[model samples]
Target: KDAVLVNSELKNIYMKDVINKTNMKITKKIGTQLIFNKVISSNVSPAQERRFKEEEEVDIYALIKSYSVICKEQYNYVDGGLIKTSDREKLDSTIYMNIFGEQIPLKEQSKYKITFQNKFVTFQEIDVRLRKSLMSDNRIKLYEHNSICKKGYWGIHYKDNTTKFTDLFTHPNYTDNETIDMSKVSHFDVYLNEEF
Candidate 1:
């Protein structure tokens, strides 16, 4: 009898902890709404020439449906690279690129703004095309920021309901003539609120 009572108490505690961690009461409708701002497709040939085109929009319902199958298909694959916890955290905060013949990581190349609502995640403004390079491998090289800025591609922006811009990740050390690059990069991290 004592063992049974202890198990029940443990189960309740675990459930409470799970609820506290999530802290969300998302409905099915909310979960199925559109979460992504846009989707783009790219093509690469054996010679390393690449081309990209903007595609149509995507919704959470379709994404989750595809995710279900992909997760199962990739469950047995051990294809991702591994690193130490400290190194992994460091990589997440900065952007890396290959300039000339050397690969370097920039302290604050660009920033992203993410939103989480009703268990869905989305980005306000994230520009990946600005980092493209002319090399066959599309390796990004660091040049003057004005090189791109003069061509009308400034950077990402996120504005609040009050019509004022908000800094998602403020790099207080921003300088006018800073040089940073993010060419040839594949992926980066986007953190969401704990409630998500």
Candidate 2:
């Protein structure tokens, strides 16, 4: 599915040039959960067709949950890390990486100690890939593979010191992290970053 963050001025041109030229339809309102009913009811990829055939109503949330399940199982075999790094000596350099995300505290933290070596961490020219459902519920999967969507990533440094990284999605250490909190997550988001 595609979302257009249109402004009043640009809406006309956007509708005419982009939306009109495509087989696109506004399936729902601005703030509604998009499900797979109309979209998947028709043309479908082999992968999606299998899903549609198996399920009566294909919910995007459910599909993502399924993917999460696959991710959890596949995590054991998948491995990724910082393929390259910036200058560790000068405290900064160009870095390249695959996947990682924010380490959210599952609950309130207390009786914990905080330490610091580097006060600042930053990433630049970060590219990202994301998967989302199609608007029509056609089971048309959409992806964002940007060359450089956002520039720079500056954040608190994890004390690992290797400039390498891995987690539930990349490595097999955190099974709890891989499991989706279905109660809270109707739809989930994951992101990765790089530094320079």
Q: Write the per-residue lDDT of candidate 1 for residues 1-196, one digit (tens) a residue.
A: 1111232332232222100011111121111121122121111222211111123212211101112224234211110011112211112322322122123233222232222222121121121212222111222221222221111112222222121211212211111111122222232332111111
**Alpha-carbon TM-score of each model against the true structure:** 0.16, 0.18
- In model 1, where do residues sit more than 4 Å from their true spots? 1-28, 35-66, 70-126, 132-196
* Number of the top-ranking candidate, with TM-score as the measure: 2
Q: Model 1 — TM-score against the truth?
A: 0.16
RMSD (CA, angstroms), candidate 1: 22.1
